[PDB]
Amino acid sequence: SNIAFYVVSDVHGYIFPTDFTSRNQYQPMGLLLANHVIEQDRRQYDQSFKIDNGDFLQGSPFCNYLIAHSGSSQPLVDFYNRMAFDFGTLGNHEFNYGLPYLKDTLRRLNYPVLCANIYENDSTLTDNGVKYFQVGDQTVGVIGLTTQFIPHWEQPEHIQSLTFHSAFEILQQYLPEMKRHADIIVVCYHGGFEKDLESGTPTEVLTGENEGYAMLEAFSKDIDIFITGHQHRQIAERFKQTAVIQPGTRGTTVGRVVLSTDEYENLSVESCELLPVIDDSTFTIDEDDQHLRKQLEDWLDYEITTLPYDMTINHAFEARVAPHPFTNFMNYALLEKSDADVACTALFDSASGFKQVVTMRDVINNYPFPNTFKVLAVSGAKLKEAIERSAEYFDVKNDEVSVSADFLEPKPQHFNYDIYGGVSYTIHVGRPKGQRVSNMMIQGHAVDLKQTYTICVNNYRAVGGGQYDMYIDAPVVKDIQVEGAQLLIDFLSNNNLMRIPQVVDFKVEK
Ligand SMILES: O=C(O)CCC(=O)C(=O)O
Ligand SMILES: [Mn+2]
Ligand SMILES: [Zn+2]
């Protein structure tokens, strides 16, 4: 006898088979197609469960569209509700629009979301943290856990009443009970691994963001299935006897773990792997779904404005290693809105700059996060520290400047490299981290390390996101409650002639 567990994670609102780079795109991804793979595959097993492991409420242009129209998650929830999931977990992105929007969403889902380590006042935010069920005369126990690092990323107003506890500690505290109650333990953690599964060597700074390895080295013998996410990696292997799974992102793959009984009648892991999501001749999309997609594409094709000249980004790396007209433009927009001495922004992975005709699609692709902004008062010394952190993005390989492995593995984080405007500087990649920034000047004046300056950063940075801890608790000079996308749209609307002065002036070399 057997049971299959199917898991999707970090779907990020990618429901349709497209990443929205162009209107007619179709590619083997998204929840509709991932779910079709599961429905076809599950028929071979005696029984099966379907699980979503977090980061489902934000990410894609579809989510941007919902916020800009109904303001409700119902159209997204509808897709999830017709698929008959058994349970899910909370990812960090479920808090991006505030606690009331999340609570409303959980009420509308027709399955439970399990989170044992996030508390609201004196009890768990979600109704439950653990769930048990039977498979023959055996009991399965499932515990849902989420990365504790949320306060380093989210707007304070969105999480003020919450308490985030270590996933390792809550698991440890629940194991005794779960071991008494169940024969099989499933842990669903919206977090990943801070050390390599085989070597055990750290693969990132041990901040507590990711605790999966610690959880496995300490409790593997009692954990039968370890479902993970957050890092967007594709992992399907065994840690000792534990089946470990991480099924990527955007419905590109589906995780499947199968358990089967012995003659003794005890359940044991039979297989653990990732199933690829592929197109096939039986897959169809309902007419109502196709109609929703059309509304979405028409909205993305909405023309914002026409520019006199082009500002396309051909090679993203080239626009990070030296000033580019598009990064100069975004920084100028921030300096004009904020009135700060300095401003900064990352060049996101999906940014392609602007062409002469700018549509809603291009705007979203250049700034696809719902970040607002803050002007912080920082000393000249703290500013240098911030530039030094960004300079860690580079490394020297084969005698030339390249992107550091730290910022590419195990997950790309181009969003953690900032390009600064209002300040000129030199980065010397061949020098030790922490002492790579030179020639800092602000308006024909060397940066006085003891003088106070103002810098406009996004809210993610303001709370230390991306290891920019020098901004935590800096005095807030101004809270700009306008998201990045709209801030650009407003700028385009008011600056017809697009006479943009040069505010980005820096260079990167050995
Ligand atoms: O919002 C940002 O700038 C950081 C991006 C982020 O939070 C993520 O990709 O997980
Ligand atoms: Mn996540
Ligand atoms: Zn994610």
Answer whether 300's CB lies under 8 Å from 361's CB.
yes
Q: 156: closest CA among 99, 105, 115?
A: 99
338: alpha, beta or left? (left if phi > 0; alpha if psi -120 to 50): alpha
Q: Is 508 in contact with 402 (CB distance < 8 Å)? A: no
First-to-final CA distance of the chain: 62
Cα-only R_g, the chain: 24
Query: SS3 of 201, please?
Result: coil
Q: In the 8-state DSSP scheme, what is residue 169?
A: H
Flag whether 445 is marked binding. Answer: no
Domains of the chain: 1-302 (3.60.21.10), 303-510 (3.90.780.10)
Please give all residues whose CB falls under 5 A of ion ligand 2, grouped by chain where several chains appear: 55, 91-92, 230
Q: What distance in Å separates the CA atoms of residue 290 and residue 16, rounded to the nearest whole number? A: 9
- Cβ neighbours, 10 Å, residue 318: 10
Omega cis (within 30) before 323: no
Q: Rounded to whole angstroms, what are the CA distances from 285 to 8, 31, 36, 80, 376?
A: 19, 12, 10, 15, 48
Q: CA-to-CA distance for 214 and 208, rounded, in angstroms?
A: 10
Task: Report whether residue 95 contacts ligand 1, using a CB cutoff of 6 Å.
Answer: no
190 labelled ligand-binding: yes
Q: Please indicate whether residue 14, judged by its CB atom, sits closer than 6 Å to ligand 1.
A: no
Burial-class residue 478 by CB neighbours within 10 Å (0-12, 13-18, 19+): middle
Q: Using DSSP, state whether 481 is helix, strand or coil.
A: coil
460 CA from centroid of ligand 1 (Å): 7
Spatial CA neighbour of 510 closest among 400, 386, 377: 400
CA distances from 447 to 303, 332, 341, 380, 505 (A): 41, 20, 11, 6, 15
- SS3 call for 224: coil
Taking alpha carbons only, the member of 187, 193, 197, 184 closest to residue 145 is 187
d(CA 475, CA 7): 43
Distances (CA, A) of 215 to 62, 221, 327: 35, 11, 41
C-alpha to C-alpha distance for 339 and 337, rounded to whole angstroms: 6
Q: How far apart are CA 368 and CA 492, in angstroms?
A: 17
**370 residue type, one letter:** P
Q: Ligand 1: does its nearest atom lie under 6 Å from the Cβ of 369?
A: yes
Q: CA separation (Å) from 44 to 35, 237, 281? A: 15, 22, 20
CA of 231 to the centre of ligand 2 (A): 7
CA dist., res. 172 & res. 89, Å (int): 18
Q: Determine which helix (DSSP H) or strand (DSSP E) holds 101, and give its type and residue range.
A: helix 99-108
C-beta of 373 in contact with ligand 1 (< 6 A): no
Asked whether the beta carbons of 499 and 349 are under 8 A apart, the reply is: no
Q: Whose Cα sits closest to atom 5 in ligand 1?
A: 415
Own/partner long-range contacts of 479-484 (Cβ < 8 Å, ≥24 apart): 479/372, 479/374, 480/337, 480/338, 480/372, 480/373, 480/374, 480/375, 480/456, 481/372, 482/337, 482/372, 482/373, 483/367, 483/370, 483/371, 483/372, 484/345, 484/367, 484/369, 484/370, 484/371, 484/373, 484/458
Element (H, E) at 104: helix 99-108
- Resolution for this PDB entry, in angstroms: 2.0
Where b means 16+ CB within 10 Å and e means fewer, 39-73 reads eeeeeebeebbbbbbbbbbbbbbbbbbbbeeeeeb
Q: State the amino acid at position 84 in one-letter form.
A: A
Pocket lining: 96 vs ligand 1, CB cutoff 6 Å: no
Residue 96 is labelled as binding a ligand: no
Question: How deeply is 34 buried, as exposed, middle or buried, from its count of CB atoms within 10 A (0-12, 13-18, 19+)?
Answer: buried
| 285 CA distance to ligand 1 middle (Å) | 31
Whether the CB-CB separation of 102 and 93 falls below 8 Å is answered with no
Give the burial string for 222-248 (b: 16+ CB within 10 Å, else e). Answer: ebbbbbbbbbbbebbeebeebbbbbbb
CB distance 359 to ligand 1 below 6 Å: no
Annotated binding-site residue? 12:
yes
Q: Is 147 in the pocket of ligand 1 (CB under 6 A)?
A: no
Name the one residue in this structure whose structure tokens are 């470990």.
244
- 36: annotated binding-site residue? no
Calpha distance 422→436 (Å, rounded): 19
Compute, in angstroms, the gap from residue 370 CA to the centroid of ligand 2: 15
Which 3 state secondary structure label does DSSP give 163? strand
The β-bridge relationship of strands 2-8 and 373-379 is unpaired
DSSP character string of 391-430: HTTEEEETTEEEE-GGGTSSS--GGG-EEEES-EEEEETT
- Distance, CA of 204 to CA of 395 (rounded, Å): 16
Q: How far apart are alpha carbons 427 and 450 in whole angstroms? A: 21
The C-alpha atoms of residue 369 and residue 466 are separated, in whole angstroms, by 15
**Which CA distances in Å does 48 have to 2, 4, 259, 263, 384?**
9, 4, 10, 21, 54
The ligand with the least distance to the CA atom of 90 is 2
Residue closest by Cα to atom 10 of ligand 1: 93
Structure tokens at 421: 């405007």
The Cα–Cα gap between 186 and 141 comes to 6
Phi, psi of 369 (to 5 degrees): -125, 145
Nearest ligand to the CA atom of 350? 1
What's the rounded Cα separation, in Å, for the pair 178 and 86?
19
Ligand 1, atom nearest to 348 Cα: 3
460 Cβ closer than 6 Å to some ligand 1 atom: yes
Check whether 428 is labelled as a binding-site residue. no
Distances (CA, A) of 273 to 6, 212, 245, 258, 261: 10, 18, 7, 9, 19
Backbone angles phi, psi at 67, to 5 degrees: -65, -40
Quick check: helix, strand or coil at residue 217? helix
- How far apart, in whole angstroms, are the C-alpha atoms of residue 105 and residue 77? 7
DSSP bridge partners of 346: 418
